Amino acid sequence: AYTNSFTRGVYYPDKVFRSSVLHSTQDLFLPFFSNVTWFHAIDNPVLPFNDGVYFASTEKSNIIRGWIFGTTLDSKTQSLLIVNNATNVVIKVCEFQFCNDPFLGVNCTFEYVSFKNLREFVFKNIDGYFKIYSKHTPINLVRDLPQGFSALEPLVDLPIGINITRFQTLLALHAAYYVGYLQPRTFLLKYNENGTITDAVDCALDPLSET
């Protein structure tokens, strides 16, 4: 299944404050109105990672709780694993030997700890530095990812140096979710009076956006 991404998937590009300004930047962004893959966990196959990922899920029930990343997923290299279970965060990179059908059951060079709603996330891995961004919002639409704009703040950067070409998501076992890929687009970002990114233009979308 597929859906329109609309203007979703913008994030704060750098750790610098700006306000009441229009600012132009080139980075891995999800293009406006791009084509997003869609799944229903009541459905967690392995997917390619490309240059980076936008991920989102619908919420009323806490089914979806984590992710796996790597190249072969079979102990031949360090594989990033993330859990965020709605009370705790746990992160690991060991040479795990996952089975062909893993779930969260209801060498480790790094380790770390810390529908009514839509949860949004962005993952990117430039030179194996795994950066993460996210957002949450209430929603009115039961079926699908609604049209709107709200930028994602950074959460974490992992200095792990890991090559990723494949990834997967983890269900809790004894909901609608989404995947789309980032591209090296130029964007014009609007920073408001309170320094929030409140709107953007994808400069390659159409000739008016290029104008």
Partner: protein
Amino acid sequence: KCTLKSFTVEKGIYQTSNFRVQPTESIVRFPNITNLCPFGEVFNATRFASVYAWNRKRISNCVADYSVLYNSASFSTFKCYGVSPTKLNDLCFTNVYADSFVIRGDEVRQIAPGQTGKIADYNYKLPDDFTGCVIAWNSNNLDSKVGGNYNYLFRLFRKSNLKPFERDISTEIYQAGSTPCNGVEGFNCYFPLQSYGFQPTNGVGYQPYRVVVLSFELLHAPATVCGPKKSTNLVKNKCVNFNFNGLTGTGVLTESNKKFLPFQQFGRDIADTTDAVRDPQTLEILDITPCSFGGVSVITPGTNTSNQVAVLYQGVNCTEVNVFQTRAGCLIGAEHVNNSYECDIPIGAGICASYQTSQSVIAYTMSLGAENSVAYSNNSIAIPTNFTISVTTEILPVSMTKTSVDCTMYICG
């Protein structure tokens, strides 16, 4: 007189070199972390890494002293890129990646940015734009052994050259032709690694050398590896020189309502200079405003008539420099007057100055002319009963001197 390169000065207003408020104190701020950085875990380990499989050590959340390294007689080379070693103790970085390995004494030439050859292309690749230091020492007494120290390995072959910092540890057979290798050595099919096998009989070029490449994560992100420098109390509402985490500048600091989100560390201007900071010891946002500056104009009657003078600090406030405030700036040595006259020397915003009685420079709002109610009514006319013939002069420039310049004789003579 020096600005005009003349001993006589005509009547007028002349700009002379600019005024700047000077920094009153120097302010220094760094994170209050106390850990000494773990560099001994790299430089003084008994074991060391093979160059085909170099070890990266993360350095973070600590106080360094890089001068302990470059003061030492121990190092056979100490190159630095994007930084000078002498200056590292004043800086602070988000992380250091200390990459570490053994190579032969000749191969130090391949441990540099943008290089080629067996070590650079098949073992350890530095980028075109590296920021860091490459530190090497002869380790014959640590890493040679009789019969050969075979514990140190290098990749002899690869099917394509590595990207910068691409840590390929694969032992899969190198294929030199169309011949299938079946995971074993054979015709056109070779193991990709070799061993240095170091012996104490080896010469200065074929001896083992230990290498550390300190690579600096230098970013807008918060810093965690700082040099050994002190930090001061903070200062506000005063022009000061300042340093936050190595970000050196000068200005008036104040508290501010700039609503930094918890991940932001600096604010930037249209010139990409910094216009706010977050302090590394308290989560408080400081606005930065430039120390006051302006042109300085000297207002003079001609030296043919007086040596008295008045001075205008353009756009400055008189609290920052008779003394009088105007929209043009702070005006000093001019007597303010409530009479109004033709504009003799122009100051700006309707203010002018002249030399008058007590013979001194005076400053006043200019008069546009005498004020005249014309005697209009619906039945009154004025008719001229006599005339005067005026002859008035007008002067117009028509040409200028016809210069020529042989640019080959101007440039090269």
